[PDB]
Amino acid sequence: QNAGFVKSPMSETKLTGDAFELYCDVVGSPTPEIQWWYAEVNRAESFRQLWDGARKRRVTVNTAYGSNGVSVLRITRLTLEDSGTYECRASNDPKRNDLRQNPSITWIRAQATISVLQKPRIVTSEEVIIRESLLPVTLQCNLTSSSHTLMYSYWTRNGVELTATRKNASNMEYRINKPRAEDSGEYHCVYHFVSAPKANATIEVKAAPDITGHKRSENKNEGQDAMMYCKSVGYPHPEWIWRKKENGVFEEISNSSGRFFITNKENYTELSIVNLQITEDPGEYECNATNSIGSASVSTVLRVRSHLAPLWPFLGILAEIIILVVIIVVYE
Amino acid sequence: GGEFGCTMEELRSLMELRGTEAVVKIKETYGDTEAICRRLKTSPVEGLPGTAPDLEKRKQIFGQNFIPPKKPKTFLQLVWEALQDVTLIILEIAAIISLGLSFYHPAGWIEGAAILLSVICVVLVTAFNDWSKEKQFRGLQSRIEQEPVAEIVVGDIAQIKYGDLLPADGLFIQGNDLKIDESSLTGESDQVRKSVDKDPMLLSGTHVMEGSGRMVVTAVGVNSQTGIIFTLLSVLQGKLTKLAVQIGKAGLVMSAITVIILVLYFTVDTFVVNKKPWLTECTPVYVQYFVKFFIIGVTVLVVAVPEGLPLAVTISLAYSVKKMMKDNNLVRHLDACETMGNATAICSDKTGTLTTNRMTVVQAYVGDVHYKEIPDPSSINAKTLELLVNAIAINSAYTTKILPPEKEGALPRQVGNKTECGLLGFVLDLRQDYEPVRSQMPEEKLYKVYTFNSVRKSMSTVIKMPDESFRMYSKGASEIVLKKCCKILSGAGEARVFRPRDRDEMVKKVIEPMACDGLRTICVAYRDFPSSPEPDWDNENDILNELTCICVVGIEDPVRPEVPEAIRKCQRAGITVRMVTGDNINTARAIAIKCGIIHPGEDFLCLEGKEFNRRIRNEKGEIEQERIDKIWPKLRVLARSSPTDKHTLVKGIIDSTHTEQRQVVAVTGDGTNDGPALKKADVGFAMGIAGTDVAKEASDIILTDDNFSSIVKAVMWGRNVYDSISKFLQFQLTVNVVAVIVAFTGACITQDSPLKAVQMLWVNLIMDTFASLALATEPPTETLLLRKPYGRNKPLISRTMMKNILGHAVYQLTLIFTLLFVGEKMFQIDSGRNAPLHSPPSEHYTIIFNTFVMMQLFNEINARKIHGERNVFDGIFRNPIFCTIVLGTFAIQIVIVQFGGKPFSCSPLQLDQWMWCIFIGLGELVWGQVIATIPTSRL
Ligand SMILES: *[C@@H]1O[C@H](CO)[C@@H](O)[C@H](O)[C@H]1NC(C)=O
Ligand SMILES: *[C@@H]1O[C@H](CO)[C@@H](O)[C@H](O)[C@H]1NC(C)=O
Ligand SMILES: *[C@@H]1O[C@H](CO)[C@@H](O)[C@H](O)[C@H]1NC(C)=O
Ligand SMILES: *[C@@H]1O[C@H](CO)[C@@H](O)[C@H](O)[C@H]1NC(C)=O
Ligand SMILES: *[C@@H]1O[C@H](CO)[C@@H](O)[C@H](O)[C@H]1NC(C)=O
Ligand SMILES: *[C@@H]1O[C@H](CO)[C@@H](O)[C@H](O)[C@H]1NC(C)=O
Ligand SMILES: [Ca+2]
């Protein structure tokens, strides 16, 4: 069939100090030797052959020979010299190897233009360690070099946009009046532009781990599951380690019988036991959480209930009934 | 007018004018009484024969007989008036303030709803209870109909009907010596005669005793002047109110102390030690703390208030009267029901109470020969037998004719004249029938009619024998007419002349021993007169003396078989019973000895009445109240006594101060003259089927069977009421001493009551609304008749109720305190002490609440025996309300502990803890068994 475009890459309007890719995919019949034609931005008449390795490996072309001609261009270290037009052409001429011929060979037009504007530069405030001090903390970031009409900006924490952080704000400020460990996290100031990719940058706020919630105690009948957990907040997120009290000191716990399940996440540490035995399982456990700053701890106590519990009070009731009826009949 | 010439208003205005002013109306306007009948479309002979179709045509003015007098009671109104009690307004005020705080809390509201129950469940029980009791009283008093044969008959003319309050009015048509009593009508006890023309008018509200005449009915209803007159218009309660007020006062003091301690401790902890400056956003937490403390104080007050004590008395009394309506005792005044429990003496009557009144003749002295047994028809000479039969038949009235016992084999019907049935029976006892000769004898020369004079008391018949031989016959008291005799029949039909030698010890040997046997002796008299000429029936001097005695018969009415046991049981219960007969002293002593009242060989006082009058009256003829005080405590039998003397006797007993304990007396009476006698006693018993309405209306208890044993059945119930209240009281006090001393002490240490507010309201609901219904309706046992009467001077809280209360409060306190302090280690469960505000309900503060409620439930059973009994389950199956209440409470307890959750601050419990709670509950009963092993005298 005739050369018809399948996936035509869009024109690139990228910036300096970046890297992007162009993806051309055309069905060939017969499949032609897929190469690329380069032209200046101001003149598309140029048809210079494009081969990987030129310009000190700043552009790489990879082509797959098969049923469908697929070509991928990777451009790195974008500068003002990377602006130009790239074309991928498919030829259906069976005698394509006769290169010494007229340019009347079958060709297609799939040009795409690439332009490069200035890279954005953001200067951000230094890293802050939240202590128990009550002084408010201000995070600052300044868009010192934008070549492009800014649309808006906002703060984000852990990928969540903070409320009421969207104004013009060519330089943007966020203040924490009462900084706590629950505030600490990976903050970002994302800059949304009209026709330019967003710039995010990073200000991490670190704090010692705090244990938010946990089960004060756990009780289960023997031969049954048991689940324990310890949420926490802080940043950067801490390492976890469980432990068990024994003979007055803390000691590491071992899988041993293969009944313990320890599931860890960013917060949260679920410890699960199966088929409890009153012999050794009852006691107290502890969920230590250690971060780069400090370590927080809290304890839980677990008791297992023997299945022969109701038997003793039943004997008590029978004893009471016997000692009552005996006295009543002896009275008469 | 037209078809009704004489309107109802005209006759009403005629009746309004009375006395001499009425004379002109009597003689003029409506002519005479026959003219009044002609205007009434009636006749002087028959009037209206009671034909139903003639109704609404002759008078058409008999609207109604005012059967429903007022009946101004409506259910909402009874609810409203019951709602006005002080305790109920206290609970309502508490609900209002609790809900008002809860709305301004920034669950919670639940408080109000819960306490609202303790209102509704009180106001609906008492109101409908009172309405039902009123309906019962209407249902039993309206059945009192004394007929004068219908409930209401108008336009008729009737003869005298003495012994009955006159329901109608109108001047008497014709008659003489008409005498009516207007004692309570106009305040004048003096009897006033009814003149033929001066004052012939008769009015309702008057009790007729004796007289003669005939009257016409001119009354309809309230339109009568008597209705117009009226249309113009408890020592236990005092002590219970005193106790209720004192308990409420103590509860108020305790609530004040608790709230003060709590707020003081909280503020001192928060500011003196912590030293936190107050901040504008810190007010609401302090608001929440203060609100919580105040709700705690309110509920501690509401628990301690006895809002169920008023209900117990009404429930007990309204159950007791209904059960008494089935025990041959009808009650019309609620005081008597409880008063009769303390009765310490009873004064009764021989006839109608201690005797069946089935009098028969047993012994007979005939033909100078004595027969103790029933005489044979041929044992005596036939001549004397036929002579006496003819004499007694011609002597007897025609009207008296044996109507076979109306039901027969169930209830006898000895016609009219009581003794006459005995004499008629003796006729058939001699194999001679009375009716043959009764019909045989015509109206002879009927001088007979001696009118049964008051002094003579002789039924006399003077007529000619079929052979035209005039003779006079007399039936009277043997001893008053014995000396009025000149001849006596013999065994061979000979009239042996009665001589003073015959009037000697022979007659006394004949009669007196039978009187000591208990037999009243009546003789037979007849004086002969010449056939020609006829005796002068004007010359009545010789006709009433020197007769001939045929025979003397001893006639007697046996004592009822059930009275000796009843009077023995009464003498066991400290109630001494006297006797006021009004008959011969010897006969009364004879019957009393075999009735068990008086035993031989012991010093006792029996008087004939004359010497009683001599001793009671002083020289001037008055009452000194001193000489009597040495007579009554040993007096048992008072014979030949007028009804006026019974009043003086009861006054002397009831007002005496010689004894330390006031004598509460209950005197029976059925005659027309005993009004003051019943009224001045503490409770008056009136006989139902054998009593005049004058006695019945001025009484408090009415006997249906006219039996003495029923009196005992009204002293077994009367005591029981008291016991009922007592046992209820016991239970409630225990709970108080264990609730308050827990909220005060607990909040003194842990800064929170171990039982929160909703739980305390549930405990109050049990102890103050369901305890009353469970313990107030306890049917009586027979043991209540084995203890002495109490009297007015006695504390409510007995000496054994204090022992039970303290003994069980010690156990409940020690167990709950041990639980609250070291129960996190015994059950191996998480502590709950010093919980923060808004904490989730724990599992250490549910065991305490559950053990507390279960301990109360298993102590409610132990509260039923107050005299030291050990078999606490004795008779528990005789009362279904009790078992239903206890099991319902237990089931609701389980459902609210298991499924309660946040509103009730209770968390679900496993099966191991429930059995421990019930184990402690049973331990309660075992401790109750132990505590009864301590004598109260040592303490
Ligand atoms: C802020 O306003 C300035 C001045 O018009 C403009 O240059 C810039 O792009 C705006 N930034 C926004 C709207 O985010
Ligand atoms: C950062 O931006 C703020 C807000 O406009 C400005 O005051 C400050 O001078 C800026 N800092 C730098 C280094 O540009
Ligand atoms: C901003 O973009 C960078 C691209 O490397 C990314 O790592 C970062 O997570 C982005 N910020 C947010 C808040 O997603
Ligand atoms: C213990 O062994 C079991 C079985 O493989 C496994 O599921 C469990 O995760 C192990 N324990 C830990 C702490 O990894
Ligand atoms: C950690 O805790 C927060 C607060 O509960 C929770 O919402 C969040 O999902 C957790 N975050 C991570 C990254 O696990
Ligand atoms: C948790 O583990 C760390 C490990 O370095 C230990 O030093 C620390 O004492 C533990 N935390 C607490 C609160 O004891
Ligand atoms: Ca109460």
Dist. CA A327–CA B104, nearest whole Å: 57
Cβ(B328)–Cβ(B733) below 8 Å: no
Tell me, yes or no, if A309 comes closer than 8 A to chain B by beta carbon: yes
Asked if residue A192 and residue A222 are part of one domain, the reply reads no
Contact criterion met (CB < 8 Å) for A303 and B828: yes
- Structural domains counted in chain A: 3
Give the list of residues 6+ apart from residue B430 with CB closer than 8 angstroms, or none: B375, B377, B380, B385, B389
- Residue whose pair of structure tokens reads 């402690």 in the numeric block: B920
Distances (CA, A) of B770 to B408, B724, B766: 50, 14, 5
Give the list of residues 6+ apart from residue A238 with CB closer than 8 angstroms, or none: A209, A232, A289, A290, A291, A295
Dist. CA B262–CA B744, nearest whole Å: 9
Distances (CA, A) of B871 to A325, A331, B728, B934: 10, 8, 18, 16
> How far is Cα of residue A3 from the mean position of the Cα atoms in its chain?
42
**Residue A62 CB burial class (10 angstroms; 0-12, 13-18, ≥19):** exposed
Cβ(B377)–Cβ(B431) below 8 Å: yes
Asked if residue A56 and residue A41 are part of one domain, the reply reads yes
Distance in Å, alpha carbon of A230 to nearest chain B alpha carbon? 19
Dist. CA B735–CA B726, nearest whole Å: 15
> How does DSSP assign B482-526, residue by residue?
HSSEEEEE-TTS-EEEP-TTTTTHHHHHHHHHHHHHT-EEEEEEE
For the record, the structure tokens of B639 come out as: 């014979």
In the three-class reduction of DSSP (H, G, I as helix; E, B as strand; rest coil), residue B293 is classed as helix
Q: Output phi, psi for B879, to 5 deg.
A: -135, 105
> How far is Cα of residue B467 from the mean position of the Cα atoms in its chain?
60
Q: Is A164 domain-assigned?
A: yes
Asked if residue A242 and residue A192 are part of one domain, the reply reads no
Identify each DSSP E strand in B209-260 by its residue range.
214-216
Closest CA to A120 of A260, A15, A224: A15
Query: What's the start-to-end Cα distance of chain B, in Å?
Result: 90
Write out chain B residues lying below 8 Å of A320, CB-based.
919, 922-923, 925-926
Name the method of structure determination: cryo-EM
Query: What's the start-to-end Cα distance of chain A, in Å?
Result: 118
**Residue B701 CB burial class (10 angstroms; 0-12, 13-18, ≥19):** buried
Q: How many CB atoms lie under 10 A from the CB of residue B875?
A: 14
Where, residue-wise, is CATH 3.40.1110.10 in chain B?
A: 360-556
Write out chain B residues lying below 8 Å of A324, CB-based.
922, 925-926, 929
Where, residue-wise, is CATH 1.20.1110.10 in chain B?
A: 79-129+238-319+715-931
| Ligand 2 pocket check for A140: Cβ under 6 Å | yes
Count CA atoms within 13 Å of residue B2 on its CB side: 0
Helix axes B845-860, B911-931, angle to 10 degrees: 40
**CATH level 2 (architecture), domain B329-355+561-706:** 3-Layer(aba) Sandwich (3.40)
Cβ(A215)–Cβ(A178) below 8 Å: no
Q: Which of B156, B169, B349, B645 is catalytic?
A: B349
Closest CA to B735 of B298, B295, B251, B294: B251
Dist. CA B292–CA B98, nearest whole Å: 10
Closest CA to A38 of A61, A62, A63, A8: A61
Asked if residue A58 and residue A106 are part of one domain, the reply reads yes
Last residue in a domain, options A87, A117, A147: A117
Q: How many CB atoms lie under 10 A from the CB of residue A224?
A: 13
Nearest-Å Rg of the Cα atoms of chain B is: 39
The answer to whether B670 is a known ligand-binding residue is: yes
Q: Is A13 domain-assigned?
A: yes
Contact criterion met (CB < 8 Å) for B925 and A332: no
Cβ(B133)–Cβ(B321) below 8 Å: yes
The two beta strands, A84-88 and A5-7, are: unpaired
- Residue whose pair of structure tokens reads 């004592």 in the numeric block: B559
Distances (CA, A) of B652 to A49, B278, B471, B647, B679: 150, 80, 51, 9, 14
Dist. CA B212–CA B175, nearest whole Å: 6
Residues 859-878 of B with CB under 8 A from A: 870-871, 873
How many Å lie between the centroid of ligand 6 and the Cα of residue A232?
Answer: 15
Asked if residue A295 and residue A228 are part of one domain, the reply reads yes
Host H or E run for residue A302: strand A299-305
> How does DSSP assign B268-290, residue by residue?
IIIIIIS-PPP-TTSHHHHHHHH
**Residue B763 CB burial class (10 angstroms; 0-12, 13-18, ≥19):** buried
Asked if residue A186 and residue A156 are part of one domain, the reply reads yes
Dist. CA B14–CA B26, nearest whole Å: 9
Best of B926, B927, B930, B931 to disrupt the A interface (most A CBs within 10 Å) is B926
CATH number of B79-129+238-319+715-931: 1.20.1110.10
- Please confirm, yes or no, whether B830 is among the known catalytic residues: no
Asked if residue A144 and residue A157 are part of one domain, the reply reads yes
The total number of residues shown for chain B amounts to: 939
Nearest-Å Rg of the Cα atoms of chain A is: 35
Q: Is A296 domain-assigned?
A: yes
Dist. CA B762–CA B732, nearest whole Å: 14
Fold of the domain built from segment(s) B8-61+155-219 = 2.70.150
Dist. CA B662–CA B827, nearest whole Å: 61
List helix spans (H) across B827-910: 845-860, 880-899
Write out chain A residues lying below 8 Å of B919, CB-based.
313, 316-317, 320
> How far is Cα of residue B206 from the mean position of the Cα atoms in its chain?
25
- Nearest chain B residue to A317 by CA distance is B919
Residues 114-143 of A with CB under 8 A from B: none
Provide the β-strand partners of residue A167: A153
The answer to whether B674 is a known ligand-binding residue is: yes
Domain interval for residue A128: 121-201
List helix spans (H) across B754-861: 757-765, 771-776, 799-826, 845-860
| Amino acid residing at B937 | S
Cβ(B931)–Cβ(B808) below 8 Å: yes
Dist. CA A232–CA A214, nearest whole Å: 9
Q: List the CATH number of the domain containing A39.
A: 2.60.40.10
Angle (nearest 5°) at CA B683 between B677 and B689: 75
| Ligand 3 pocket check for A188: Cβ under 6 Å | yes
| Amino acid residing at B773 | L
- Long-range contacts (CB closer than 8 Å, 24 or more residues apart) made by B906-911: B906/B759, B906/B841, B906/B846, B906/B849, B907/B840, B907/B841, B907/B842, B907/B843, B907/B846, B909/B843, B909/B846, B909/B847, B909/B850, B910/A305, B910/A309, B911/A309, B911/A310
Dist. CA B346–CA B642, nearest whole Å: 18
The total number of residues shown for chain A amounts to: 332
Distances (CA, A) of B579 to A4, B355, B632, B684, B878: 140, 13, 12, 15, 38
Where, residue-wise, is CATH 3.40.50.1000 in chain B?
A: 329-355+561-706
Contact criterion met (CB < 8 Å) for A324 and B828: no
Cβ(B40)–Cβ(B6) below 8 Å: yes
Question: What's B360-556's CATH class?
Answer: alpha beta
- Residue whose pair of structure tokens reads 């109050």 in the numeric block: B764
Asked if residue A73 and residue A12 are part of one domain, the reply reads yes
Count CA atoms within 13 Å of residue B697 on its CB side: 14
The two beta strands, A217-221 and A299-305, are: parallel
Asked if residue A61 and residue A37 are part of one domain, the reply reads yes
Distances (CA, A) of B609 to A249, A280, B612, B615: 107, 102, 5, 10
Asked if residue A77 and residue A17 are part of one domain, the reply reads yes
Best of A215, A221, A317, A322 to disrupt the B interface (most B CBs within 10 Å) is A317
Write out chain B residues lying below 8 Å of A307, CB-based.
none
Dist. CA B767–CA B744, nearest whole Å: 19
Cβ(B299)–Cβ(B755) below 8 Å: no
Give the list of residues 6+ apart from residue B476 with CB closer than 8 angstroms, or none: B456, B457, B458, B459, B460, B522, B523, B525
Q: DSSP state, B54?
A: G
The two beta strands, B360-366 and B547-556, are: antiparallel
> How does DSSP assign B613-672, residue by residue?
HHHHB-TTS-B-SSGGGGTGGGEEEE-S--HHHHHHHHHHHHH--SSSSPPPEEEB--ST
For the record, the structure tokens of B728 come out as: 């209820």
With residues binned 3-state (H G I as helix, E B as strand, rest as coil), the percentages for chain A, rounded to 5, are: 10, 45, 45
Dist. CA B77–CA B70, nearest whole Å: 15
Q: How many CB atoms lie under 10 A from the CB of residue B45?
A: 7
Contact criterion met (CB < 8 Å) for A313 and B871: no
Last residue in a domain, options A179, A201, A223: A201
